[PDB]
Design a protein around this ligand. Structure first.
Ligand SMILES: [Zn+2]
Ligand SMILES: [Zn+2]
Ligand SMILES: [Zn+2]
Ligand SMILES: [Zn+2]
Length: 385
């Protein structure tokens, strides 16, 4: 279960670089130089890194300082063979974004948010990023009167449309991916789930330029089934990027290493990504717990990748098992994949076997055999066949 760059594993600079500051606690680790993170991640078998503008260049840097930071980062990438497949903008840390970036009530803040984003899109393209993520963590409200949501969605659409106009005007191939989250740090965050983001994207002027970057923990913070959400995103052709970590149910965003939290959901996620042939980065957005020192940080990062590879093996074994294939037929998964009425509406209406002569009792009596199928899945996950 040793990862290599061919496995496409990526990490945010802000993940392994998390200093351990939480709402009730000060930092437990010193800041990392992005250069050292690139080196350490490469040694572990990572394929690349991702960044917020403010992770790579200290906020407020001069053009000269900016150039020097990028120069050192570029050298680390060249020294290691590491890539930068995705970037994003920090529109949440600075107090100016306390009511949002793109949907701040203050118009001047919204304009600044767009300019800050655009500047980093240029840099992202320069560093080779194919995906530009937006997490609207400050977009929302703690109280009902503070945010007219229809107005806010108008502003959100305007922002994304402008960003699409910009990339098109520069001939960039980069695409956007919205990363949903239901709450935290706002009481309620706009576009709170994969569903809400997907629906919003359909109203953008150039919908083809936008997808989702769903995070395991975030959908789980709404008690939702992450594999189900990913399936809907795939069904819509919008899984542009994936965001991997762990979470124990409905509480604050834990960002545990991937495999931690809901282990069986991680199994079914890997099963789906591999079955669907998802070809993008396998990106980790996780926090090594603040209990850890730097050795613990790298152990937690290594664990992300190891757990993906273990689950990939077990899912593949599950699907390849002739006994499982038989169980899938017993549970009529084959029938699920067949059209309900390829014969058409009129034929359906005229088909007495569909209603007038349908034996509902005989159909009802047929067990689905899902428990046997699921215990085969459990046995495969646990290596207990
Ligand atoms: Zn690649
Ligand atoms: Zn500096
Ligand atoms: Zn998270
Ligand atoms: Zn994330």
């Amino acid at each position: 279960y040793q990862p290599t760059p061919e496995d496409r594993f990526t990490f945010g600079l802000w993940t392994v670089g998390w200093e351990g500051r939480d709402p009730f606690g000060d930092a437990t680790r010193r800041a990392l130089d992005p250069v050292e993170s690139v080196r350490r991640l490469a040694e572990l078998g990572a394929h690349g890194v991702t960044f917020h503008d403010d992770d790579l260049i200290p906020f407020g840097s001069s053009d000269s300082e900016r150039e020097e930071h990028v120069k050192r980062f570029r050298q680390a990438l060249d020294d290691t063979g590491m890539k930068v497949p995705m970037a994003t903008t920090n529109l949440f840390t600075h107090p100016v974004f306390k009511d949002g970036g793109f949907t701040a009530n203050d118009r001047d803040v919204r304009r600044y948010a767009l300019r800050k984003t655009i500047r980093n899109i240029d840099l992202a393209v320069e560093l080779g990023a194919e995906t530009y993520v937006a997490w609207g963590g400050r977009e929302g409200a703690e109280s009902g009167g503070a945010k007219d949501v229809r107005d806010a969605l108008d502003r959100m659409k305007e922002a994304f449309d402008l960003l699409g106009e910009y990339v098109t005007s520069q001939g960039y191939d980069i695409r956007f991916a919205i990363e949903p989250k239901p709450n935290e740090p706002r009481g309620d965050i706009l576009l709170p789930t994969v569903g809400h983001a997907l629906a919003f994207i359909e109203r953008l002027e150039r919908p083809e330029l936008y997808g989702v970057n769903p995070e395991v923990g975030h959908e789980q913070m709404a008690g939702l089934n992450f594999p189900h959400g990913i399936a809907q995103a795939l069904w819509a052709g919008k899984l542009f990027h994936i965001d991997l970590n762990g979470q124990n149910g409905i509480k604050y965003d834990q960002d545990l290493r991937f495999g931690a939290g809901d282990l069986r959901a991680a199994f079914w996620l890997v099963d789906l990504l591999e079955s669907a042939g998802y070809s993008g980065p396998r990106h980790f957005d996780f926090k090594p717990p603040r209990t850890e020192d730097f050795d613990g940080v790298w152990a937690s990062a290594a664990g992300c990748m190891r757990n993906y590879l273990i689950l990939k093996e077990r899912a593949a074994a599950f699907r390849a098992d002739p006994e499982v294939q038989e169980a899938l037929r017993a549970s009529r998964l084959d029938e699920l994949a067949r059209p309900t009425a390829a014969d058409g509406l009129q034929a359906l209406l005229d088909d007495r076997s569909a209603f007038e002569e349908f034996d509902v009792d005989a159909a009802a009596a047929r067990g689905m055999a899902f428990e046997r199928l699921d215990q085969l899945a459990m046995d495969h996950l646990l290596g207990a066949r």
